[PDB]
Structure 1
Amino acid sequence: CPLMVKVLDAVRGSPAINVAVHVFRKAADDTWEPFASGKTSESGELHGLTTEEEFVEGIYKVEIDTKSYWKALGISPFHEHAEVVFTSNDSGPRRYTIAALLSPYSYSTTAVVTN
């Protein structure tokens, strides 16, 4: 599992469950092309997005549909979504965890890169 997503809810103090997540990769013509997607689990995690073979060096965007999440809880949000854009790097063995902490008018994201 080279790429995992974990989403947390800062209002409810809980995993952010059933959040849609879309991953894109930048294509040669500089557009975003769909790559993988899913919904977070009961633990706020999304595994199995891609494989080591498919996850080649490139520019990737992880789009977290925060607005639908807050609307489902009845809370007025600011952002359309949370976007995390990064270049993957094959400098030795690496696994990427993209973590996001959500509030209605704020979000934080960090990358946990491990070998």
Structure 2
Amino acid sequence: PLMVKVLDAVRGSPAINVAVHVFRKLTTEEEFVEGIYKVEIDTKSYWKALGISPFHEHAEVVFTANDSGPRRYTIAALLSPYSYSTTAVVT
């Protein structure tokens, strides 16, 4: 016998975030789960898994990468509930 119980009775006005998981029993992947409440903001990638036999004989390659510039990011509340409160962003 397997039982799980959460939050039987509630009187009032809360804020909640619930998650429940139960498990009973060149690249390979099997039987996985990814991304329950997942956040990604800025991510970069250049070269990945070109192939079996690239650039075998007598190759000449030049590789250069530049990253610059004016950028801004602004966030007030992230992944956090609130009740009976005040939030403001003023510029």
- The TM tier, using the shorter chain, reads under 0.3
Q: CA deviation at 1:18?
A: 10
- What's the counterpart of residue 21 of structure 1? 20
1:65/1:55 Cα in 2 relative to 1: closer, same or farther (>3 Å)? same
Matched, 1:89 2:66: yes
Higher relative contact order (CA 8 A, sep 6+): 2
Report the Cα offset of residue 4 of structure 1. Answer: 0.8
In the alignment of these two chains, the number of paired residues is 90
Could you tell me the TM-score, scaled by structure 1's length? Answer: 0.13
Show CA shifts across 1:37-87 (max 9, x none).
Answer: xxxxxxxxxxxx999999999999999999999999999999999999999
Cα deviation for residue 24 of structure 1 reads 3.6
Aligned-partner Cα distance in 1 for 2:59–2:15: 13
The 2-side partners of 1:60 and 1:51 are apart by 25
CA distance in structure 2 between the partners assigned to 1:107 and 1:76 by the alignment: 61
Q: 1:97 to 1:16 in 2, by over 3 A?
A: farther
Cα displacement (A) at 1:7: 0.2
TM-score, structure 2 length as denominator?
A: 0.15
Partner SS for 1:14: coil
Name the one with the larger strand percent: 2
Aligned-residue sequence identity (percent) comes to 99
Are 1:99 and 1:110, in contact at CA under 8 Å, matched by a contact in 2? Answer: yes
User: In the TM superposition, what is the alpha-carbon distance from 1:10 to its structure 2 partner?
Assistant: 7.8
Cα deviation, residue 12, structure 1? 3.9
**Could you say which structure has the higher helix fraction?**
1
Consecutive unaligned residues in structure 1, runs of 5 or more: 26-48
